[PDB]
Paper text:
APOBEC3s (A3s) are an APOBEC subfamily in mammals that restrict viruses, including retroviruses, endogenous retroelements, Hepatitis B virus, and Epstein-Barr virus. The double-domain A3G, A3F, A3D, and single-domain A3H (haplotypes II, V, and VII) are active in restricting [name]-1 through deaminase-dependent and independent modes, with A3G being most potent among them. For the double-domain A3s, the deaminase activity resides only on CD2, but the catalytically inactive CD1 is important for regulating nucleic acid binding, processivity, oligomerization, packaging into [name] virion, and effective anti-[name] activity. In order to understand the structural basis of domain organization and molecular regulation of the complex biological functions of A3G, we determined the double-domain structure of rA3G.
Two fl rA3G mutational constructs (termed [name] and E/Q) yielded well-behaved proteins and crystals in different conditions that diffracted to 2.47 and 2.40 Å, respectively. Additional changes in these two constructs improved the solubility and yield of rA3G including replacement of an 8-residue CD1 loop 8 by the 4-residue loop 8 from hA3G-CD2 (as in both E/Q and FLK constructs), further mutations F126Y on CD1 loop 7, K180S/L184S on CD1 h6, and 8-residue deletion of the CD2 loop 3 (as in the [name] construct). While the [name] structure shows a canonical fold of its CD2 domain, the E/Q structure shows significant alteration in CD2 conformation, with major changes on helix 2 (h2), loop 3, loop 4, and the Zn-active center. When aligning the [name] and E/Q structures via their CD1 domain, the CD2 domain of the E/Q structure shows a rotation of ~29° compared with the CD2 of [name] structure, causing the E/Q CD2 domain to shift ~15 Å downward and ~8 Å toward CD1, and resulting in a much closer packing interaction with CD1. The CD1 and CD2 domains in the [name] structure interact with each other mainly through h3, h4, and loop 7 of CD1 and h1, h2, β2, and loop 3 of CD2. Combined mutations in [name] partially affect its catalytic activity.
Residue numbers in the entry:
A (entry chain B), B (entry chain A): 7 to 142, 147 to 246, 255 to 382
The structure:
Amino acid sequence: NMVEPMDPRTFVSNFNNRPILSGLDTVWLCCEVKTKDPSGPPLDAKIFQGKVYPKAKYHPEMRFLRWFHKWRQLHHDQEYKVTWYVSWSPCTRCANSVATFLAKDPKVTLTIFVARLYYYWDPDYQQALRILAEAGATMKIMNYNEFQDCWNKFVDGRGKPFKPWNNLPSHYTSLQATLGELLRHLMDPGTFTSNFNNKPWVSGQHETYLCYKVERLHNDTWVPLNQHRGFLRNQAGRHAALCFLDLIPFWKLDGQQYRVTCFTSWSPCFSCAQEMAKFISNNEHVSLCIFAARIYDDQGRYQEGLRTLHRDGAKIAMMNYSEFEYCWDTFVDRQGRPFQPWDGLDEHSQALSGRLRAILQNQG
Amino acid sequence: NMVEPMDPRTFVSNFNNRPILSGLDTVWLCCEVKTKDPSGPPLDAKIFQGKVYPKAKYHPEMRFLRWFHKWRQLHHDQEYKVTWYVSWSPCTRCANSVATFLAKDPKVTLTIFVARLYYYWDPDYQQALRILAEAGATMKIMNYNEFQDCWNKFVDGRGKPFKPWNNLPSHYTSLQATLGELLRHLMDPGTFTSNFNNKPWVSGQHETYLCYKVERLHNDTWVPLNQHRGFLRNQAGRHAALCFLDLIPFWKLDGQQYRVTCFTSWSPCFSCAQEMAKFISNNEHVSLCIFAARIYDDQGRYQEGLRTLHRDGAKIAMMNYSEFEYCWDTFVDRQGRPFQPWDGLDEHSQALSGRLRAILQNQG
Ligand SMILES: [Zn+2]
Ligand SMILES: [Zn+2]
Ligand SMILES: [Zn+2]
Ligand SMILES: [Zn+2]
């Protein structure tokens, strides 16, 4: 079995799913590496533990990555299926290191079972889970069978079986509903209504939401690629347009002709416009179309940015009624409700279209 | 009277307060300069017009600043009361230029009557109005009397009297309530509840709100200065802690000893911590007290920043129930309702206190 199994009290203290209020100290990761055949024996199994504070370098997911890099050198270059049972959901830094690892090595596939979710006072925690999902990691809450499997495979049970605790199924249900909500797919209607708006009073909105879709040129028709379809938002300290650029390479598009469409609630500031100019200049097989609900004055060179983005290709347009309705129909968890326009939508669209046409062309 | 009066049709289309949906073109500013004596005759009166797009250098508030700078060199060095009737509220750039002019020149006081509010798709429009108010500008909605006075003093009416339009009062009332809301002074309760919270799930909250109060040391008792008391929030492209430092010189504090207290919904990132350390090093008569609702991990050197701030003086502490309740009582438009704690408030306070005590100190 295992070289040094987990102590039953450690398991009971850490692999549990009832809500608690204490801060984190140590997190545990039970890890199993298998071949491509699910009924093959496990190639290896190891337990990792790490202190949450004060450095993420020592979190068990980082220890796993460093371990796995040396461990894989000692076998043939083959496909691996890795499974983690982890007592708490990973931190943002580790979510990003794992997503990058998965993206750079397609021969590894990862399934992550978490006992409980932790959020780390991170305003961008949701986007960390979403980046893991985009890099191919499967993430589920541990249910009865997984707790019992981790008990059998990793705990020094001394013949004793997994004894469940009271309300285990109920905590599972609540956590899994929470996880599914964090991994949505379709945007919340209140989110759409708070952000995709063009009234000149913007209700103090500093967030930028971005709905994206990709089409491929195939026998001279544009065919949708619905597996690359969704929405994102800005991060604390990283603008939404930059996160969109960071998302694109996870799609691993080939050299065919692609058309990427973004509906963004704010047009790009100058710096994000310049990064988008660089991206489209280095990826000319990719046609970029940006529709903005509002024009963002970054108190600087945003007009130069919009003109530079327009000149390097890229269609830039203000959203009209039709684009708003399309975004609602296509990206919103609307449950059959129709689009509901707000007063002045068409007039503000017309005024903003004029301002944009004036920015392009010239006068400033 | 005046050398160039406004044409009645110009007044009718621009000095009106009914809601409209069109974009802005030209804005009008009727200006009257008087001495400190209300019963003195007006020394001068001038009309300015400016195109809103594409450069704020030509907005009428800027033309007024350039004109007035030359005008006052040619008149007596005395105190002046300036009155503006302006067809729309100023843009951010003009609001800040006027605030700076007012702050650097105490012998001039400005009253601004606006026919209608315009928001320019600016997420920080509220702060522009608020910085105008903190520099001493009085800002009111034009009522019947102000429309009538503007008509008499500035319009080529050819003996005709001011004729009001239908719903002048009702639009006035709606507009003045909106303006009063923009200059609040006391924080809306929903704002407080959405931002001053310490659950480790932060609801993606990227805003930082900051409540401040000032004390004076007088014969070794700490006296409040309730004229320097309020709240602010971050801007697009400028963090809340920087906005607070920018605010402090508007207070024109002398060389006595002052204690400034911040209750912030996020502890400062590294760059803001360093700017605050610079501030307290250049203003040793000002003792700084920071209470944070949550610790903000800026994905960089934020722990060094908190340590530097703590080493340079400056008390850094996490908010407990007592501080939350004090902020509710002191800064919130609570209308007599008591503070309502949320679940886990005390436990999350204790966990964050532990983390902060570990960050100060050391361990990594
Ligand atoms: Zn981590
Ligand atoms: Zn940007
Ligand atoms: Zn202006
Ligand atoms: Zn900061």
